[PDB]
């Protein structure tokens, strides 16, 4: 059950929940998006094909001719990845599309083909995705984070009484297309209804209703109910609906059937309706006063005069009733209104409506959208139509349509990409209904409303918008005549598309540099989920609500991992097991719970679906049958937790660790620390510098191998095999027989990236972790990358720690460090700096890099060669010369001050058509030889593999081992053999051999071409030389190291070992922390970690002691087995008996520096098991031991806590910060010292410091500081002279910047000046 390689070191594991689902591939969400962006999809609903099919075809205005799309293709990348990294160009691919121009016959009827031609026009280059996912623009590999933008669709929102000071809420509704103009409906404080478009001037909505050719009566019919009055013999015996009688009061005597159903002054009881419906009465005689203040539904006209008596939407009055009665009107329809059920919200807006007809409404709309421009009868209609119903300018994506239909309780989850009359009508109906109370407002922070968006969609949109320009160009071209001789090459231009895409990738608010000083850094950065960017809110105008953790984040977004400070809750990281919905939401797995059994089958639920069911959490004690030992089980039902029955549940979590990010997943004993301090620990964990040789953490959380392998640093075998030959540079594996493909056997081979600068100037290289003749298995590690050990993450070093104050040297958070840490040299870190020098072309001719320069002793020149370039491997120091460059009339590059190191790599580049000096030719030749020899070795290795295969296939059916060696490999393929598929295989292998020959013979020439060719360059630059310095920053007081529990500190001193505290056993401790830190900032996780690590180290030490004196495997097997025992029903269950009795020896060897221990974050090891494990060692179970002082030698009373802790050295080096400036350069427009360490700038005496100096009586010093030390030219010149002359005095004068301000003001019409 355990892999051979796995048996090298197997981490003792705690935890009891049986893992049911392994972590998925972390880097999934990226490669799939970009994969879909570029594919040949026949459905034409993904990536480039959708866009092409959308924009195309294109029809001329006449249109006598059109240009349509056919198909596309991507050419081969011109250069490989490494070449693009070297030169610094984009790793792109040409795009070639076959367009098809057709020509009709003009005089012939509509639809005919006079002629037709086509070609494959080139257009644009699209950057490609590396295997990891990252892109390479200019050898500056970057990464694109994903956005979290609100989804398109509809939203009913409400302002919560935050306006008008009236306490009255105001429900608004918004429609947001995926591409087009927005739309808003709003309720006035006066119950009016206002449309607003793209945040422009407000408008009554009934206007836009009329825009749909809708009249008054149509609208009223749509939006209200009718009440029919009957002019009859006796004064309006009105028909009535009993259902309209809830919530009224009888104002008169309601009587029918000779029965007074109710009298005036009475409220309409439910039982009144009961008796009414029981009597089944419908018509009630009503007094005329009931129609006192009503409004007519439609218009009524006199039949004879044909003149309207009362146009629709008109109040009611007695004389009007008389006119109806004389007009013979019998049916009188009015609006059924109410104050709590049906407010007349439409009627008010209609009365506000100044327009009545379609034309005027459209005209005023046009005026609103475009101020001025006296409209025409066609401008408004064209505007509106192309605005809200032309698919080309307005578009709800499929997601939009789905969400829209969803919100409106529709049935179809598919529809059109544009709007429709019914759509708006239903939207407004729903808004009105919400106003009446039915239906409820919808929040925004719900995860069910915001959508992720990866690279592909954005790239497609950029491609489309670029395409639009060339579309317009070709359309205006085809509108022009002279079509007989056109070609689909002249009208098409590549520049627009190239610009449109290149600008986005190279320069956008989402394509950002990659932090690369860790595997973890790269991983966590790639999984980032930003909320800023185009279409996203702004960093500095975000309220608390966005930053706060909505309850729906559970399991989909890590809540504890975030960059604090100016931007919190905006740079949220993804949770571990989270997936992406087909649409782009966030889904999470859940174990299906049947009637009473917890199945292993899983379903990925979206945010919205979760709100319905009931889910028990991860740590619910079931017993082998999903039968929960308990009965009141904790479950998150819907935005809250509770205890429910043992049968009502529907789903269970997958694993305890599905709530956190990968980044925070690595902190042991997380469940004990505070939240914010864990966040700090994680963020600092993201910044660890790789050490010289990594060390496994004694106490991992078990997530280490996943992170390591999933990252691209380490070289993981792909098909198990056997090491055939190893080297520091490359590896070769003879593939296993079965994994081998039928044809083209070959053998696996790997090459190793040696020391290369990272994105953070930290060298990176790989080292093999296997020897010859070592069997290997698929997916196993082979080459340790940075900060890795045996294919598991290892950032910092584990060290012996003790908690106590010590002479104040650890006063606040200072960390006192013994001298062994540096003597044994386990924290030195390597760095690489690149320095460039160019040869511009200027007046007085150009300048050169000649080795000869004026006014310099030969001492400096001793290190350069004849050409003027330092030799490789030279050990330069601060203030040296690297390349000698001349003043055309001494611009020689020099080492930056203070920096030491060694030159390791030189490179040079020249404009094409320029001669090349000695050194350049030398390097070219050396590269030539290198590539030649490399390919020779590769080819012969492959041929050896092929002939090994050929020998293997001849071992059966005519094997003559003698005959093999009698005549050499040159003539083996031709040997006779029984007639079967074996002969076919022999022919296949021989064919592959010849193919290998030809491939190498051509690839050599290809590489020769790549090398010998010239180099493109920016205008003016004749050549560029780059040099690489390597340095080893070791350690100093001032550096910043930290533990994993957000317990950072600054190293303060390096005591000699003899002063360090030491135990009675003679081992001195290596670090002294300050106990005072823990209680205030509640992080006990470090203390528990210390105890556990001490236990582990004790076990390792016992094993080492057992080994030191020779002890047979008999004792080792026993002791190791017992050690791996003693778990509280742990799931490890490792057996030693099955081992080869020598893997036992190697495992013991790997454990003599401790026994690694695992700890799932929320399934950690409680106190008792730690106590038991300690007692397995001979250490005091209390954890605290007595100590003795280095100086005095006497014992410390009060037994002290000591153990081991894993600690990192962060990337804030003291050498990088310490800086000074006495007198340097000067800004140009204003004469002040420059700023920043890059230049030799000075500090900024800020305004608050001016205030502070004012607070003291200090006046002279302030005056001098802001007059002579910074600004006044003559003042500082004469001050320099005075200081040289030993005379401390100054002459103030006036600041220049004030004169600058004076001139600037006077540039305006303001005459400002100084008086007498």
């Amino acid at each position: 059950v355990y892999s051979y390689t796995e048996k090298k070191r197997i981490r003792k594991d705690f935890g009891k929940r049986p893992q049911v689902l392994d972590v998925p591939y972390l880097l999934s969400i990226q490669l799939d998006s970009f994969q879909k962006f570029i594919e040949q999809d026949p459905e034409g609903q993904y990536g480039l094909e959708a866009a092409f099919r959308s924009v195309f075809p294109i029809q001329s205005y006449s249109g006598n001719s059109e240009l349509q799309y056919v198909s596309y293709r991507l050419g081969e990348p011109v250069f490989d990845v490494q070449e693009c990294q070297i030169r610094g160009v984009t790793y792109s691919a040409p795009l070639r599309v076959k367009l098809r121009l057709v020509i009709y016959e003009r005089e012939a009827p509509e639809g005919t083909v006079k002629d037709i031609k086509e070609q494959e026009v080139y257009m644009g280059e699209i950057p490609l995705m590396t295997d990891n996912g990252t892109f390479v623009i200019n050898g500056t590999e970057r990464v694109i984070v994903s956005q979290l933008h609100r989804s398109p669709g509809v939203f009913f929102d409400s302002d919560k009484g935050k306006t008008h000071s009236s306490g009255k809420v105001l429900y608004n509704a918004r429609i947001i297309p995926y591409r087009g103009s927005w739309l808003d409906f709003e309720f006035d404080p006066k119950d009016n209804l206002f449309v607003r478009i793209d945040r422009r001037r407000k408008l009554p909505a009934t206007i836009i209703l009329r825009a749909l050719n809708y009249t008054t009566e149509q609208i009223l019919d749509l939006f209200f109910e009718k009440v029919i009055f009957e002019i009859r013999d006796n004064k309006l015996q009105m028909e009535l609906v009993p259902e309209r009688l809830r919530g009224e009061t009888a104002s008169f005597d309601i009587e029918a059937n000779g029965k007074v159903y109710v009298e005036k002054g009475r409220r309409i009881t439910a039982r009144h309706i009961r008796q009414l419906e029981k009597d089944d009465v419908k018509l009630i005689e009503v007094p005329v006063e009931y129609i006192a203040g009503k409004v007519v539904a439609k218009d009524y006209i006199d039949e004879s005069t044909g003149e309207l008596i009362c146009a629709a939407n008109m109040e009611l009055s007695l004389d009007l009733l008389a006119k109806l009665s004389q007009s013979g009107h019998k049916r009188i329809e009015t609006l059924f209104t109410n104050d709590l059920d049906h407010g007349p919200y439409i009627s008010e807006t209609l009365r506000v409506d100044p327009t009545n007809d379609r034309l005027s409404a459209l005209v005023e709309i046009y005026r609103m959208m475009r101020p001025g421009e006296p409209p025409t009868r066609e401008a408004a209609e064209s505007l509106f139509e192309n605005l809200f119903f032309s698919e080309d300018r307005y578009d709800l994506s499929a997601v939009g349509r789905m969400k829209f239909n969803r919100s409106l309780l529709r049935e179809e989850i598919e529809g059109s990409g544009i709007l429709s009359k019914d759509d708006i009508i239903d939207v407004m109906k729903k808004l009105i209904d919400i106003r009446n109370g039915k239906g409820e407002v919808d929040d925004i922070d719900h995860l069910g409303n915001r959508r992720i968006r990866s690279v592909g969609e954005m790239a497609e949109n950029q491609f489309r918008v670029g395409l639009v320009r060339v579309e317009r160009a070709v359309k205006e071209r085809l509108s022009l005549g002279d079509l007989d001789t056109l070609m689909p090459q002249d009208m098409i231009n590549a520049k627009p598309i190239s610009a449109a895409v290149k600008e986005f990738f190279g320069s956008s608010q989402l394509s950002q540099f990659m932090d690369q000083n860790n595997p973890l850094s790269e991983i966590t950065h790639k999984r980032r989920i930003s909320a800023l960017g185009p279409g996203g809110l702004t960093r500095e105008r975000a309220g608390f609500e966005v930053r706060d953790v909505h309850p729906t984040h559970y399991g989909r977004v890590c809540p504890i991992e975030t960059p604090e400070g100016p931007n919190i809750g905006l740079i949220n990281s993804l949770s571990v097991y989270a997936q992406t919905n087909e649409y782009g939401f966030l889904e999470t797995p859940y174990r299906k719970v049947t009637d009473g059994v917890v199945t292993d089958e899983i379903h990925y639920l979206s945010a919205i679906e979760e709100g319905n069911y009931v889910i028990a959490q991860a740590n619910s004690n079931l017993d082998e049958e999903g039968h929960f030992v308990e009965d009141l089980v904790t479950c998150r039902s819907k935005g809250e937790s509770s205890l429910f029955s043992r049968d009502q549940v529907d789903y269970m979590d997958v694993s305890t660790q599905q709530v956190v990010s990968v980044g925070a997943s690595l902190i042991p004993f997380l469940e004990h620390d505070d939240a914010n301090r864990a966040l700090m620990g994680a963020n600092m964990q993201r910044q660890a510098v790789p050490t010289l040789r990594a060390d496994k953490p004694l106490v991992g959380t078990g997530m280490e191998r996943a992170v390591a392998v999933d990252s691209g640093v380490t070289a993981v075998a792909k098909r198990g095999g056997v090491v055939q030959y190893v080297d520091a540079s490359r590896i070769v594996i003879k593939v296993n027989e079965d994994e081998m493909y039928p044809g083209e056997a070959g053998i696996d081979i790997y090459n190793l990236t040696k020391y290369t600068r990272s994105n953070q100037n930290t060298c990176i290289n790989q080292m093999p972790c296997v020897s010859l003749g070592e069997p290997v298995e698929r997916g196993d590690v082979l080459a340790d990358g940075p900060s890795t050990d045996l294919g598991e993450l290892a950032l910092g070093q584990n060290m012996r720690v003790a908690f106590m104050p010590w002479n104040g040297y650890n006063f606040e958070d200072s960390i006192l460090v013994s001298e062994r840490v540096v003597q044994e040299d386990r924290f030195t870190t390597i760095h690489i700096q690149e320095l460039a020098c160019v040869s511009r072309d200027t007046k007085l001719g150009p300048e050169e890099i000649t080795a000869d320069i004026p006014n310099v002793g030969e001492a400096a020149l001793s290190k350069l060669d004849e050409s003027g370039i330092v030799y490789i491997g030279a050990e330069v120091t601060g203030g040296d010369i690297l390349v000698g460059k001349v003043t055309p009339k001494d611009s020689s590059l020099r080492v930056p001050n203070g920096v030491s190191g060694t030159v390791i790599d030189v490179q040079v580049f020249t404009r094409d058509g320029v001669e090349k000096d000695k050194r350049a030719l030398e390097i070219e030749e050396m590269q030539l030889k290198q590539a030649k020899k490399d390919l020779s070795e590769e080819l012969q290795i492959l041929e050896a593999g092929l002939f090994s295969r050929i020998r293997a296939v001849l071992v059966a059916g005519g094997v003559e081992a003698e005959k093999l060696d009698k005549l050499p490999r040159d003539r083996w393929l031709e040997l006779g053999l029984t007639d079967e598929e074996k002969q076919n295989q022999l022919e296949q292998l021989a064919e592959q051999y010849d193919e290998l020959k030809h491939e190498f013979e051509k690839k050599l020439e290809a590489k020769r071409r790549k090398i010998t060719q010239g180099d493109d360059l920016a205008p003016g630059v004749l050549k560029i030389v780059k040099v690489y310095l390597a340095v080893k920053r070791r350690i100093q007081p001032g550096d910043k190291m930290a533990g994993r529990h957000g317990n950072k500190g600054v190293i303060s001193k390096i005591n000699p070992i003899e002063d360090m505290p030491y135990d009675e056993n003679g081992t001195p401790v290596d670090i002294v922390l300050n106990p005072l830190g823990v209680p205030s900032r509640m992080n006990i996780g470090q203390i528990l970690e210390t105890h556990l690590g001490m236990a582990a180290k004790g076990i390792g030490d016992k094993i080492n002691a057992m080994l030191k004196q020779q002890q047979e495997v008999a004792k080792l097997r026993e002791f190791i087995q017992r050690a791996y025992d003693l778990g509280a029903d742990v799931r490890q269950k490792v057996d030693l008996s099955t081992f080869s009795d020598e893997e036992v020896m190697r495992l013991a060897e790997n454990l003599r520096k401790g026994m690694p221990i695992a700890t799932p974050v929320f399934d950690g090891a409680k106190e008792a098991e730690i106590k038991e494990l300690l007692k397995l060692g001979d250490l005091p179970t209390s954890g605290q031991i007595r100590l003795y002082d280095g100086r005095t030698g006497e014992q410390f009373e009060r037994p002290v806590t000591v153990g081991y802790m894993y600690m990192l050295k962060l990337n804030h080096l003291v050498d990088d910060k310490m800086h000074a400036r006495s007198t340097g350069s000067y800004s140009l427009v204003t004469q002040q010292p420059l700023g920043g360490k890059a230049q030799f700038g000075g500090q900024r005496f800020g305004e608050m410091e001016v205030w502070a100096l004012e607070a003291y009586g200090a006046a002279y010093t302030l005056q001098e500081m802001l007059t002579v030390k910074s600004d006044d030219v003559n003042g500082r010149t004469k001050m320099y002279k005075n200081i040289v002359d030993g005379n401390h005095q100054m002459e103030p004068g006036m600041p220049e910047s004030f004169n600058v301000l004076l001139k600037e003001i006077r540039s305006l019409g303001i005459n400002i000046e100084l008086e007498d």
């Binding site: 639809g111 037709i116 031609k117």
Partner: protein, 69 residues
């Protein structure tokens, strides 16, 4: 592969018959490969501009582009 002259454009190489859609109408065309693999689809109805090569150099004909010290 027989060389063909179309007076509108020039000399191409006959490359068979094909069916093409042209905005809802499927029509039969004769496809000629001019220089740089530029396909030209002549409607079979317009067969009269398709003439046979006359230079006596069927295998040595040209292919017009469609459109000391």
């Amino acid at each position: 592969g027989q060389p063909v002259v179309h007076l509108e454009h020039g000399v191409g190489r006959y490359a068979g018959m094909t069916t093409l859609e042209a905005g809802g109408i499927t029509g039969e065309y004769l496809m000629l490969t001019y220089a740089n693999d530029a396909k030209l689809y002549v409607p079979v109805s317009s067969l009269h501009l398709i003439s046979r090569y006359a230079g006596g150099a069927e295998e040595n004909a040209p292919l017009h582009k469609l459109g000391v010290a």
